Scaffold this active site. Structure first.
Site, mmCIF file in Angstrom:
data_model
loop_
_atom_site.group_PDB
_atom_site.id
_atom_site.type_symbol
_atom_site.label_atom_id
_atom_site.label_comp_id
_atom_site.label_asym_id
_atom_site.label_seq_id
_atom_site.Cartn_x
_atom_site.Cartn_y
_atom_site.Cartn_z
ATOM 1 N N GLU A 172 0.803 -1.226 0.000
ATOM 2 C CA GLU A 172 0.000 0.000 0.000
ATOM 3 C C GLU A 172 0.833 1.272 0.000
ATOM 4 O OE1 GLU A 172 -1.856 -1.614 3.571
ATOM 5 O OE2 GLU A 172 -3.733 -1.861 2.450
ATOM 6 N N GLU A 367 -11.630 -4.173 -1.672
ATOM 7 C CA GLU A 367 -11.115 -5.402 -1.041
ATOM 8 C C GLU A 367 -11.601 -5.494 0.408
ATOM 9 O OE1 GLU A 367 -6.891 -5.402 -0.583
ATOM 10 O OE2 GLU A 367 -6.529 -5.584 -2.688
#
Ligand SMILES: OC[C@H]1O[C@H](O[C@H]2[C@H](O)[C@@H](O)[C@@H](O)O[C@@H]2CO)[C@H](O)[C@@H](O)[C@@H]1O
Ligand SMILES: OC[C@H]1O[C@H](O[C@H]2[C@H](O)[C@@H](O)[C@H](O)O[C@@H]2CO)[C@H](O)[C@@H](O)[C@@H]1O
Ligand SMILES: OC[C@H]1O[C@H](O[C@H]2[C@H](O)[C@@H](O)[C@H](O)O[C@@H]2CO)[C@H](O)[C@@H](O)[C@@H]1O
Ligand SMILES: OC[C@H]1O[C@H](O[C@H]2[C@H](O)[C@@H](O)[C@H](O)O[C@@H]2CO)[C@H](O)[C@@H](O)[C@@H]1O
Ligand SMILES: [Ca+2]
Length: 516
Positions: A172, A367
């Site tokens: 990320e 997600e």
């Protein structure tokens, strides 16, 4: 869905692969039969991590793509698509990891200073990923790794549907502010990660560039700094998050801190389009973490987001739109709590990121943050994905549905959907001037009987005098719905007499005509 429209016609469901290599889990033959099983339940492709510590382990330019080619060949054989993740971060140390793949050991010997790793407010060193401030080592190494990968996977281009980039820890774009060794794991406040000698120098040089001299710094910050060496990151992060953030120093420090992630986004999105655009011609994307704890804490507001690098989400997404990357938000299955000690607000956060992304025209994918072991959480992912225009949803992770046929069956019904356009027609509506007709229904793609935020708008046909509209529906799922009139002032004047249904929705385009 939001603003009178329906679900995204491009929606697709995706499956995350194991963190470990497929031979350390099962064999390639039952792996190919599991992908055929996955595709019968609505999955379009499998996303998989190809680790840097495996692809260039021995030395610089000494590459090994044999595991990536062998995985791509079994996907070919099973008739599915894959989405590789060029994982330039460490596997091991985060939530759910059960693997141990550090980045190549030799990358740390390319420098003698402390420009490559991170150091926290209290001295904790982190080496999970490369510090985005060392952009010279990043342009060299990522540049080489992306081009060697495109040349080696050029045979499998027809099996590649998208390509994902790793922007930092756990894949990320963010700083490693919540970790066990630093004492900043959930639900605690994060610690700032700018305390290496190189980061202090870089902050000092950007301030002096913005203002010119120490003199102009003191006049703008309203301070009485003695020497240029006194221009530092916060000596106390807690005091900074309680109120230093409101000062002019505070706003300039958070602009530089988040600014480093915005510039890393533009560098890696440029290296990725150069290497892949000609060969593959697929969408490229990156991911943003869902730091939902300490969100509404009164003493330290946004106490976990700001140390992770998230101060202004609108300016962060703008870097994504200019680097030409799609965005994935990783937290859809949770509900809002907002109470002490965690002060958690995940659904408000997902609604805010989705609104900003849809305003800016950025393709949005979602997600789940943690393993789902219940149908109720699939209904919450469904509400967000179909009412906030998500183009995709990826399920974490393989084994949760592949070894549980009842959960796999619930996923197929709720989320493994194929969207198909259909025409809805309603006759004999007693409409008066200013009224508008909408339709709402039982499934999440019809708004779940909601009349304020999620109904789908229809349109008057002055030639046959009925209300109609092309709506995106879930092919071959049973649905129930009713049309209703909304007055000039947002109130529900009346509902359709009888409840309608389509049992199931056909997968070829037709019309469903009914009367009031
Ligand atoms: O990068 C790791 C991951 O952290 C967060 O996941 C949380 C989870 O939401 C909490 O309920 C708790 O279990 O701690 C986890 C790890 O800190 C973010 O939600 C997620 O997006 C983020 O990527
Ligand atoms: O396989 C992709 C990545 O999965 C894990 O990280 C997840 C994490 O489990 C989840 O809670 C969070 O919300 O999103 C990240 C990113 O998808 C691994 O930790 C990563 O190393 C993997 O790349
Ligand atoms: O670089 C100037 C000084 O910045 C920090 O001090 C901040 C502090 O973090 C903030 O919370 C407070 O409200 O404002 C001051 C700026 O006057 C460092 O802590 C100092 O060491 C620096 O000299
Ligand atoms: O709110 C859930 C219910 O929505 C509809 O029910 C309408 C009904 O159609 C209408 O005639 C009546 O006047 O108001 C209710 C809403 O309060 C669905 O028809 C029901 O099946 C839902 O449960
Ligand atoms: Ca290299």
């Amino acid at each position: 869905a939001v603003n009178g429209k329906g679900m995204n016609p491009d929606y697709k469901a995706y499956l995350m692969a194991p963190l470990k290599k497929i031979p350390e889990v099962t064999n390639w033959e039952t792996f190919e039969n599991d992908l055929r099983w996955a595709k019968q339940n609505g999955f379009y492709a499998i996303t998989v991590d190809f680790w840097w510590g495996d692809m260039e382990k021995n030395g610089d330019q000494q590459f090994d793509f044999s595991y990536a080619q062998r995985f791509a060949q079994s996907v070919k054989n099973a008739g599915m698509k894959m989405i590789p993740i060029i994982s330039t971060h460490q596997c091991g140390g985060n939530v759910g990891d059960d693997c141990n793949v550090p980045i190549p050991s030799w990358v740390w010997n390319q420098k003698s200073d402390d420009s490559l790793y991170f150091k926290s407010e209290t001295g904790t060193v982190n080496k999970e990923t490369l510090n985005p401030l060392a952009s010279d080592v990043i342009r060299k190494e990522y540049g080489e790794l992306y081009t060697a990968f495109a040349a080696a996977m050029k045979p499998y281009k027809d099996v590649i549907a998208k390509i994902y980039l790793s922007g930092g820890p756990a894949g990320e774009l963010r700083y490693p502010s919540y970790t066990t060794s630093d004492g900043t794991g959930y639900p605690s406040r994060g610690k700032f990660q700018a305390y290496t000698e190189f980061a202090k120098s870089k902050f000092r040089l950007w301030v002096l560039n913005k203002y010119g001299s120490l003199n102009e710094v003191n006049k703008a910050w309203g301070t009485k700094l003695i020497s240029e060496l006194a221009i530092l990151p916060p000596s106390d992060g807690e005091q900074f998050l309680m109120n230093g953030y409101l000062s002019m120093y505070g706003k300039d420090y958070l602009e530089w801190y988040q600014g480093i992630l915005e510039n890393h986004t533009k560098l890696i999105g440029e290296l990725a389009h150069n290497a892949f655009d000609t060969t593959f011609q697929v969408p490229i994307g990156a991911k943003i973490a869902g730091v939902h704890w300490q969100y509404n804490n009164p003493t330290i507001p946004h106490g976990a987001e700001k140390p992770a690098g998230y101060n202004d989400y609108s300016h962060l997404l703008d870097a994504f739109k200019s680097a030409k990357l799609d965005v994935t938000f990783t937290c859809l299955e949770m509900t809002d709590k907002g109470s002490y000690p965690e002060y958690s607000m995940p659904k408000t956060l997902v609604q805010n990121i989705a609104t900003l992304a849809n305003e800016k025209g950025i393709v949005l994918n979602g997600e789940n943050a943690l393993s789902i072991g219940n149908e109720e959480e699939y209904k919450r992912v469904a509400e967000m994905a179909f009412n906030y225009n998500f183009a995709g949803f990826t399920l974490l992770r393989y084994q949760d549905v592949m070894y549980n046929n009842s959960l796999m069956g619930k996923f197929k019904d709720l989320l493994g959907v194929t969207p198909v356009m259909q025409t809805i027609v309603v006759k004999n509506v007693p409409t008066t001037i200013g009224d508008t007709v909408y339709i709402t229904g039982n499934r999440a793609e019809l708004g779940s009987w909601d009349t304020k935020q999620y109904p789908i708008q229809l349109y008057y046909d002055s030639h046959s005098n009925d209300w109609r509209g092309n709506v995106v529906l879930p092919a071959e799922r049973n649905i129930e719905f009713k049309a209703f009139i909304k007055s000039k002032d947002g109130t529900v004047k009346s509902w359709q007499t009888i409840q309608q249904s389509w049992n199931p929705v056909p997968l070829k385009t037709t019309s469903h005509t009914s009367s009031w």
